[PDB]
Design a binder for this molecule. Structure first.
Ligand code: 5FD
Ligand code: 5FD
Ligand code: 5FD
Ligand code: 5FD
Ligand code: 5FD
Ligand code: 5FD
Lengths: 291, 291, 291, 291, 291, 291
């Protein structure tokens, strides 16, 4: 019953993803390939990271995550494959996902394979890891990889070997922690009783605005549900509401809701109306919150 | 070989749909998840309804339809799960899908689970139902559901239990008919001998124009194939053509075809050219037809 | 084990693709349906051809390719089903896909089913074929096909019977070569020294520019990796770079790379930046290359 | 030295204004024609009114204002010509315009000629009038006016006769006050200590936002320069600044300025940056202000 | 008293028009410069023609028309200066412009100066001409003309000398009729009964649709006011209305009016709403009319 | 016959420019007001400068240039009024505008009045000046100037007094050279033997591309007419052509012309087609030229 959950920047407009899938079914006949998404901004490693960081607790143990934007395709770089440690706790977000009390996942139960370009930065931060290897063995990659298609050659193909039971430690040599490329995550700042961050994403298709200011940052400031907040975007577009659990708490349709999203980050929206689209709000815009 | 057919407003730009799928495979390991679409206009319950109403006759018996736009997420509302009666929008004669004379489907062979917000209005009207229940059991939903993700908590999760053979009647208490929310469907009005309705959809990616004017409305004003029609749109733009079964009946490429769509509604198109896009025709525009 | 790889112009915005998939699972319960793509420009048979021509070597033997844009839907036309000969564009060696030396695929191991409208022109040219039949038998198509949905009736449905092991030669009468509709492929011309073609596609989502000037055309001029080229787009844009294997060979981010894409065609891009989007370059613009 | 100041909806893209001007120079050889503007939204009488209400104090005594949007062109309607009473005081706005203490204008010194469609509503409100006449005499309009060009026939042409010294009372019969069409001006409301109005205009080319909340309404509420204000636009986009005389009082470039515009209305802008354009703010959006 | 009416493709976004005007005042101190328009599509001589053909009857006798789009700037080409014959399109009666019965204009009373590129084609056709000269004398053009600014050097400058009374016949040698470049005017054709032309212009800023089907073409078919017409735009839009004198005859706001515009051509619009803009109708689309 | 040539950022969509003109005619009854343009990007002092720097040689002696973008409106700043020295950007030989050998203009024949914000930087550099004064006298500005309209109060009004013969030296105290604000003009840098500059403007309405690379920069790297050039734009888009005096030298319509504009700067265009618009070329993009 193996699963590969596949996240790329290949888009869905041509046969690129299908070539990868065909090879996945070829290598691992029993596999199920689940699309995460293929629409990320090409080469935006930070955005790709957002789409994969929270996946493990949702998937059956033993799932392989094939995650790739590969701007260094065709160079001497090689992918990294890592077995993560914890599926939740740090990335708990509530706790375990599923019905009842949720589904507890054993430690060391998920593998990610990716370009070694920092794509896995937040996965490693949130989940930790037990082992990491450079992906070099001709048992799991082509002897003559297509220079402009490493998302296929160096990620899709070896992910299928791993799903098929190829031993992780046999993909190539162990990588020391310092050899795993990471991106810098900008910290939430204090100024002086207010918290200053950024719009991390526009939540399509709804036009909700998500910031990088986390529940932990709020509860550190004595901010919880019911707190009257001022949330200023782009430095000049401000908004005022109490922090509420959900959209409908804003009352009438179109009213402003300030809430915590399902990943636990301070967010702003209109109730059953789009906030970002009419005002052309964008990721990267500053976001400041105060009580 | 259980199937879940999954229709949401979650989009395909982030990991939202994948989180749902991971849980489906977690709960029902042998499941096949089939995407209906995830692109509907958020919170447009009437549009969501059109994408799900005619699904049962195409699917194997025992398929579960997980269908959701959930603007009331995080409120005290709970989903409804219903077993439908007739698979066909027909009866005796049926109009079954498939090769030869098509595949007849037994009655009571399909379950829908959806927010109780009217999404199922036309499914219930066209198909009838045998039983309906409120979805409240912690055996099939989380004890601590994520307030902003009821499409996952209250639809995806329980649909996978249902696919896995969890008894429908055990998801919660029976709902009386009046407790199942319905939307009103605006009637085609009669203006002299013209039928007056609306553009119900622009049929992407083709730019065909679908109206809410049914064959039955037409064959009550004296109109069948071959009839010379005048179809007026948005109160301004006029077209004239005989009613024909298909696009190529219009003759040359670009010529106007007035026809009945595969759902049996009065529609207008250009033959192998887009009608809607160059004239910026839109859903909700008035549509008037006369012989 | 059977697989149907499905390429259509139906889009991903309504239930059209799902209706086809439901019927595929109905007819061939153990099938895996793999999406190629559903976003092609409607009725653009040359574009559809590009998404399907290179598929066979990526898929397990016995895979059925259901490939369809059907502007002649509802007419007396019938689909064609063909068994291809060679899975490669090559053979001597092969450039087989996969890890190690790749997966060699037996001859006669793939079936395409498509409208007989030229969609398979390049499939037939690159792979050859062993047999071809008109798709007419009520064992594999509806007795009463929906006039406006032949992509479902005349492609999806019979593809599932073929996947389930329905004998290919029983779908209908053999077709003679001349009865298989072909489109003309404009040839890459010569004057010089130089080579005059077109932009065949903008490679979404990256904005790379693909030409119809093939590596075999380049070989014909003794043009290889390292050669300083002038590539003029649209008649007035003399791009200059050496031919290199990949994007990063251009050096700095945003620099011009002239390269051979994974399909083997002369292409041009910027290194980890979009070439086509900022300057609105488009398919159909002229492309001239010289050393 | 006569002047006609000319405001129309004819645009500047064809010869329409030039035909009018040629006739003006023909009728009144010594005249100077000054363009006010020709770009108003066609048929928007309220917008046209904004462009003409404040003109008299800027112009030499004896100036004729030819002001026209004529959606009733070619009907039995006839223009109105009015001599206004006061050039300023009510429409003082500071007081008199010009160097030193400004240029005092005698009463009864300006004539407007316009369609009788309410275009002059605010001119009459702010300035009063001494006499008003229907424009019917063949001495000042064509005997056979072009049905679709009353802006020329019934405004431009007679305005030139008036500039040339044709007696105002000879254009046709006197009009009683009730025969002069007026539009309704929505009042600024109180709720309960806040003032609720509308964005009256986006001030192009700067993207400043002008409201219909006047200095008089503010000083009625005890609001003056230095007051810390909250100005909420579109019901949800709020802004906070002190009321200042000018843009640069906001400090850094791009900072929000809340100010009184040169017509004396509460306005909001960014300092040397556009406010309206990045956020797509529009006329008609609600505007609420409170101290 | 002299007047120069100035039509160019120079735009209103830089100092180009002002440079020409400065030179006009330098050469003819007492001149009045009247702008026709400066916004024509550059190099579109047929469009430029439309803005200048009807000017003479609106202006005092002796007016000089400086009219220019000059794509051949900087070549050996020289402008043409012509004295026109008839100020009208008529004569018998005349439909003179102005109050009363209008201002009759003497023959031979207007001069056009233009590039010899066909810009004056319709001026010559409708008005006739008495004399024409090549503009070559260094008394009226620069000895060293700016290569890229012949609209200034070869039109604006000599127009001012002509306005100042420089003898027309002294500008250079007489031109024979065949040396005056003309463009072809596509004829209004017949098949029926019906009349087949084109949309000649979208009438900005209103979005009315003007055709090249003239009142004299309509008279030829016995088509007059009151006739129930079908006007098909773009081949597929059979508009139906009676021919009426003006917009308001259509009744309700937004209703279709088919009318004769002030230039005498069959036109179509909505009553106080834009026809062309919502449906993106364009110049060059086919136009067919029948009764 | 005094002239004021008027350049502002006020636009032509409301009554702002007309208010200024009315006051000009009020103060100087015999004045002619000539519009330069009113469309400049608000607050872009460098762009404003380009529209005014070469005006004097085209205008009669004694013309006053009223030139204004006033982002510091309502502050303690006051305008500067200067009498320039040389009318030509030349000296001996001069390069005079007009018919024959052009019209020589006496030294000290023109006055500019402008905000003291650097708008006059290039006027002063190219022309020199004889005297400069701060504009403060209540004889020429309002005692109570409208805070948000200094373009009217501190430019329009005093320019009309100056046109009327008010002694320049009486507007206020003399300004020392260091008190006249200047902007810095970025130099063309030298990279090997390539000249590196920028796109200074897109030349609307034509879509020609003007660079800041002067003939003098070129004829110092060894480039005159006939020289084969490579011009690279935005660091990506390449063009190649000989330097020619005009557009038609390129041959066929659409062919690339590299030329010197009427201001003597290196420019690039298509022959009677727009270059900038299809490729979305923009001001501020890098421009590099080499022989
Ligand atoms: N801004 C929103 N207002 C109301 N509902 C919303 C909003 N954004 C997302 N949703 C709904 O949340 C459900 C999550 F399961 C989705 O299906 C959206 O309908
Ligand atoms: N407007 C159309 N003209 C011709 N063919 C069309 C049109 N719209 C959709 N189609 C074709 O219908 C087939 C249904 F199976 C699709 O594959 C479209 O190509
Ligand atoms: N233009 C490009 N520059 C650098 N990388 C690119 C470019 N276009 C595509 N790619 C990467 O190639 C990988 C294919 F495997 C994709 O994942 C792109 O990230
Ligand atoms: N790119 C151009 N090609 C041909 N002619 C042009 C171009 N740009 C501007 N012009 C013409 O130059 C004349 C200057 F007087 C203008 O009238 C333009 O028509
Ligand atoms: N389509 C139109 N409907 C009603 N009025 C119109 C329309 N187009 C132009 N106009 C008016 O005609 C007058 C010409 F004098 C202009 O002022 C327009 O307001
Ligand atoms: N928002 C603005 N910030 C700074 N200056 C502005 C703004 N809007 C208009 N202006 C300037 O006001 C002057 C009025 F005379 C105009 O010329 C603008 O430059």
């Amino acid at each position: 019953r193996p699963i590969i959950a596949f996240m790329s920047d290949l888009g869905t407009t041509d046969d690129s993803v299908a070539q990868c899938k065909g090879l996945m079914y070829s290598i691992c006949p029993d596999v199920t390939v689940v699309d995460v998404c293929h629409s990320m901004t090409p080469w935006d490693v930070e955005e790709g990271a957002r789409y994969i960081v929270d996946l493990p607790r949702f998937f059956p143990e033993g799932t392989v995550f094939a995650t790739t934007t590969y701007p260094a395709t065709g160079t001497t770089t090689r992918s990294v494959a890592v077995r993560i440690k914890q599926a939740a706790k740090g990335g708990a977000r509530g706790q375990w996902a599923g019905s009842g009390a949720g589904f507890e996942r054993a430690e060391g139960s998920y593998i990610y394979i990716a370009p070694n370009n920092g794509l896995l930065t937040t996965v490693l931060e949130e989940h930790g890891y037990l082992e990491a290897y450079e992906v070099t063995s001709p048992k799991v990659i082509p002897e003559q990889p297509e220079p402009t298609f490493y998302s296929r050659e160096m990620v899709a193909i070896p992910s299928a070997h791993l799903a098929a039971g190829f031993p992780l430690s046999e993909v190539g040599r162990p990588l020391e922690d310092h050899e795993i490329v990471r991106f810098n995550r900008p910290a939430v700042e204090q100024d002086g009783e207010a918290l200053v961050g950024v719009v991390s994403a526009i939540d399509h298709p709804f036009g909700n605005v998500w910031t990088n200011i986390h529940r932990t940052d709020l509860e550190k400031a004595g901010i919880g549900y019911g707190a009257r907040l001022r949330l200023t975007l782009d430095g000049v577009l401000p908004f005022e509401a109490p922090l509420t659990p959900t959209f409908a708490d804003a009352g009438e349709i179109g009213n402003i809701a300030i809430y915590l999203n399902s990943r636990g980050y301070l967010s702003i929206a209109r109730n059953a109306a789009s906030l970002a689209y009419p005002y052309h709000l964008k990721e990267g815009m500053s976001a400041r919150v105060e009580a």
